[PDB]
Write a protein that holds these residues in place. Structure first.
Motif, PDB file in Angstrom:
ATOM      1  N   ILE A   1      -1.048  34.600   3.722  1.00  0.00           N
ATOM      2  CA  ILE A   1      -0.552  34.619   5.123  1.00  0.00           C
ATOM      3  C   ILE A   1      -1.130  35.810   5.857  1.00  0.00           C
ATOM      4  O   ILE A   1      -1.639  35.694   6.965  1.00  0.00           O
ATOM      5  N   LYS A   2      -1.090  36.977   5.229  1.00  0.00           N
ATOM      6  CA  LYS A   2      -1.629  38.193   5.860  1.00  0.00           C
ATOM      7  C   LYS A   2      -3.128  38.045   6.192  1.00  0.00           C
ATOM      8  O   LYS A   2      -3.560  38.340   7.299  1.00  0.00           O
ATOM      9  N   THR A   3      -3.903  37.522   5.261  1.00  0.00           N
ATOM     10  CA  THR A   3      -5.336  37.273   5.503  1.00  0.00           C
ATOM     11  C   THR A   3      -5.547  36.389   6.731  1.00  0.00           C
ATOM     12  O   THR A   3      -6.441  36.649   7.538  1.00  0.00           O
TER      13      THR A   3
ATOM     14  N   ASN B   1       3.958  43.976   9.590  1.00  0.00           N
ATOM     15  CA  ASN B   1       3.854  45.401   9.878  1.00  0.00           C
ATOM     16  C   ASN B   1       2.926  46.148   8.926  1.00  0.00           C
ATOM     17  O   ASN B   1       2.551  47.282   9.216  1.00  0.00           O
ATOM     18  N   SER B   2       2.548  45.519   7.815  1.00  0.00           N
ATOM     19  CA  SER B   2       1.531  46.083   6.909  1.00  0.00           C
ATOM     20  C   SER B   2       0.084  45.889   7.385  1.00  0.00           C
ATOM     21  O   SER B   2      -0.855  46.391   6.748  1.00  0.00           O
ATOM     22  N   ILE B   3      -0.101  45.160   8.479  1.00  0.00           N
ATOM     23  CA  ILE B   3      -1.409  45.010   9.098  1.00  0.00           C
ATOM     24  C   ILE B   3      -1.658  46.237   9.945  1.00  0.00           C
ATOM     25  O   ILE B   3      -0.924  46.516  10.886  1.00  0.00           O
ATOM     26  N   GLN B   4      -2.712  46.964   9.599  1.00  0.00           N
ATOM     27  CA  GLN B   4      -2.953  48.280  10.184  1.00  0.00           C
ATOM     28  C   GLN B   4      -3.681  48.179  11.514  1.00  0.00           C
ATOM     29  O   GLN B   4      -4.540  47.307  11.679  1.00  0.00           O
TER      30      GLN B   4
ATOM     31  N   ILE C   1      -3.384  35.840   9.333  1.00  0.00           N
ATOM     32  CA  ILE C   1      -2.978  36.490  10.555  1.00  0.00           C
ATOM     33  C   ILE C   1      -4.072  37.493  10.985  1.00  0.00           C
ATOM     34  O   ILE C   1      -4.425  37.547  12.151  1.00  0.00           O
ATOM     35  N   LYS C   2      -4.607  38.283  10.052  1.00  0.00           N
ATOM     36  CA  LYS C   2      -5.658  39.226  10.419  1.00  0.00           C
ATOM     37  C   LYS C   2      -6.903  38.515  10.940  1.00  0.00           C
ATOM     38  O   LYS C   2      -7.517  38.985  11.904  1.00  0.00           O
ATOM     39  N   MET C   3      -7.241  37.375  10.342  1.00  0.00           N
ATOM     40  CA  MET C   3      -8.388  36.602  10.824  1.00  0.00           C
ATOM     41  C   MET C   3      -8.169  36.104  12.252  1.00  0.00           C
ATOM     42  O   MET C   3      -9.085  36.109  13.056  1.00  0.00           O
TER      43      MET C   3
HETATM   44 CL   LIG Z   1      -4.551  45.739   7.135  1.00  0.00          CL
END
Ligand SMILES: [Cl-]
Ligand SMILES: [Cl-]
Ligand SMILES: [Cl-]
Ligand SMILES: [Cl-]
Lengths: 443, 443
Positions: free
Chosen positions: A382-384, A440-443, A386-388
């Motif tokens: 999921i994080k990958t 919130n871990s996405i910098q 959202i960052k993309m």
């Molecule tokens: Cl990040």
């Protein structure tokens, strides 16, 4: 990070509950760019496309295409339904969208796109039976499903059954009639024929406007896909899955609200017929991935193995609720569609994902990345995703139709309200599920 | 039965050996209707389409489409080659056809159809790189194969290697270059792009003019089929089979005549690559029929199961000499294509056979029936096919493009010289194989 929403005075429809939801999510999110994008995208439909008359009608434009799609409009207001019990004006506007959708179906149950009045337009010249109330008349199964999906969710959420009027009853009978016509059991041709003089091969139908042959095994033929591209084999699998679920919702409404058991029974029995034919014809034993769902089949034995970004898609089956996310055939399919064994999966320097023949080679649709996230059972995945989505918007702060796999600055549809809605819906889902730490871990 | 040939003074080209052959066959055949049709059809190409300049050039029109196709022209004079040693003027004319075909290839190796001079025409506006010397520029692998086939048979029959000039050397180099470009290994798009604004879906290409994606497994992409319809998956199997054989004929010519062993080896190496890829990708395990050849594949794992009437076709593989008639996979395929499991096989009150999406539902092409006869190992099947051809011509005494399965009076292309040639060729073949008694048993 100044907002890219329109100035307050220029916003077409304002919902106090939507504004409070946005304030709340901005407070919870620590990533300032993500928060800004959420604020741009979640209310874009209301800001820029909603024409509510204050009474019983809401017309909803797609964005940079100036007409109303049954598909887009059904998705564009979807995540707002959960706020309807807190906001009377929002609730009225949602009921207006549904009432408008049923009126559109009543105008022509084969049509994908509608005008607000009788303006006509550029596609009056299409070789098909047109009316000036139509923007376009591409037959797409999912056009009839999205409004049923919206109406059912609105009813379950609010308890307001007043949407299930005599116009609903006329519309759902047209849905049944149209689906059954398009099983093409008695006639390989039938009442729907479409050609257009165009350079785009998938904006007209083969075989003199009838499409490629089908063997009438019980599935419903769709002339066009949710991409608006013509199908290759007409039994479009994701759309048939969506029809099954949508007919069952319709049956529940017809028994419970309208006390119209014969129509309900027709919906139920058709849903079971289509489901049985999917089990018998829609599965392919892939030597690499195991049993997967085909994208399209013809009933003769041909099966097209691919996916297209537009929902309903294969990857999105659990998002719409048509299969369980744990369905082993779905999990195999998920691996296949997100790979270079899918002709419409693309990977380059900027990211990866699924597109389709609508825009062509190397153009990834954000919708595919969003649906990967929606249907994920893994936080890192999921994080990958959202960052993309953040890193492929060309800095615009909005969701596009597609972007080039090696250059997000080459993109299509700057103003695509369905896609903005989906992004807002995704972030809201993740926060409501207790995954704000992940975001919130996405910098 | 008065002949439907033109009166003698209106015949464009007259061959003594052809007239002797016709008179011989007419004397042997006892069925007056069959003899009449043979006489109408066998010389139709010479009677109505050949423009020989008396020196080194022959231009050959298709019939009722007023341009020269590399495919049609290569087939239209095919059965005359066996008569060339006894007729110097016929021989000269055939060499002129070959020389013109190499000239065409040298003008544009991607083009299917050519003008005699620089007339231009309806298709000059197509969205592709057009020149007035072209009638049409639809890339079809078989366009480059038919001339090599004709040339090789002319050389082997007559011993005349003078046709393999420097213009041949340029041409065969363009064939190699073109085939390799269309393996699409380094560039999935490439130098050939095509669209046309048309209501006919298969007269333009998907994906912005590049066609559906291929995975570059070694096969050659064909943008269009011998029907002139766009391919669905570009690795068109019958045409790739034809390419293997044609490249090996070219290698033999280049080794023996031109003393160009490196260019010859380039042909052989490519032939081996395509052949290996056909083995790996072109076979489908059909649950009813066993292992069959797919019609088109994309290299990703998609396989389209069907046949189209136009040669090169699956049923015609042994006619062109690309597989042996008792290849087990071929025999399985033969059963499959002549069945209702093939979406373009039709059966009606008038007969049965294969068509395609070019003319659309229910329209059977006599070419499919002829090819069934050409590839038959059974006299009774042959007789049935010949009778069907006689019974589906609407009394015209010619071969048509297509006819309705329930009414042969509903037909397309009254004047189609390729088809007339094939009928004459079939009858001549059967007489030369000792089967006149079979023909004379038709009452
Ligand atoms: Cl990040
Ligand atoms: Cl057509
Ligand atoms: Cl049932
Ligand atoms: Cl008989």
């Amino acid at each position: 990070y100044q907002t890219n929403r329109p100035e307050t005075s220029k916003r077409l429809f304002v919902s106090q509950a939507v504004e409070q939801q946005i304030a709340h999510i901005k407070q919870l999110l620590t990533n300032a760019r993500l928060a800004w994008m959420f604020e741009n995208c979640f209310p874009n439909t209301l800001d820029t496309t909603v024409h509510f008359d204050g009474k019983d009608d809401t017309f909803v434009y797609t964005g940079d295409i100036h007409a109303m799609w049954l598909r887009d409009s059904g998705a564009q207001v979807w995540p707002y339904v959960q706020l309807a019990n807190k906001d009377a004006e929002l609730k009225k506007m949602l009921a207006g969208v549904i009432k408008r959708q049923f009126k559109c179906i009543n105008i022509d149950p084969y049509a994908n796109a509608f005008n607000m009045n009788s303006e006509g337009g550029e596609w009056m010249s299409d070789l098909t039976d047109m009316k000036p109330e139509l923007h376009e008349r591409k037959w797409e199964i999912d056009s009839l499903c999205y409004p049923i999906r919206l109406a059912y969710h609105y009813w379950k959420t609010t308890g307001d059954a007043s949407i299930f009027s005599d116009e609903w009853l006329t519309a759902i009978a047209k849905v049944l009639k149209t689906f059954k016509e398009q099983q093409r059991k008695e006639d390989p041709k039938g009442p729907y024929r479409f050609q257009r003089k165009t350079e785009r091969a998938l904006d007209t139908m083969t075989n003199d406007g009838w499409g490629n042959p089908v063997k009438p095994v019980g599935l419903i033929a769709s002339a066009f896909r949710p991409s608006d591209d013509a199908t290759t084999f007409q039994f479009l699998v994701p759309s048939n899955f969506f029809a099954v679920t949508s007919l069952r919702k319709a049956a529940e409404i017809l028994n419970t609200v309208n006390k119209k058991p014969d129509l309900a029974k027709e919906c139920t029995t058709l849903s079971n017929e289509v489901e049985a034919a999917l089990k018998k014809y829609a599965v392919y034993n892939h030597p690499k991935y195991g049993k997967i769902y085909a994208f399209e089949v013809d009933g003769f034995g041909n099966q097209l193995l691919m996916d297209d970004a537009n929902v309903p898609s294969l990857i999105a089956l659990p998002y719409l609720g048509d299969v369980k996310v744990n369905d082993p055939i779905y999990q195999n399919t998920r691996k296949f569609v997100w790979s270079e064994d899918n002709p419409y999966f693309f990977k380059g320097t900027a990211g990866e994902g699924i597109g389709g023949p609508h825009i062509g080679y190397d153009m990834i649709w954000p919708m595919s990345i969003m649906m990967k996230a929606f249907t994920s059972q893994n936080d890192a995945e999921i994080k990958t995703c959202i960052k993309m989505l953040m890193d492929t918007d060309a800095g615009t702060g909005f969701m596009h139709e597609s972007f080039h796999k090696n250059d997000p600055k080459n993109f299509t549809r700057s103003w695509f309200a369905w896609q903005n809605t989906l992004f807002g819906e995704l972030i809201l889902k993740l926060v409501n599920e207790g995954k704000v730490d992940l975001l919130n871990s996405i910098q």
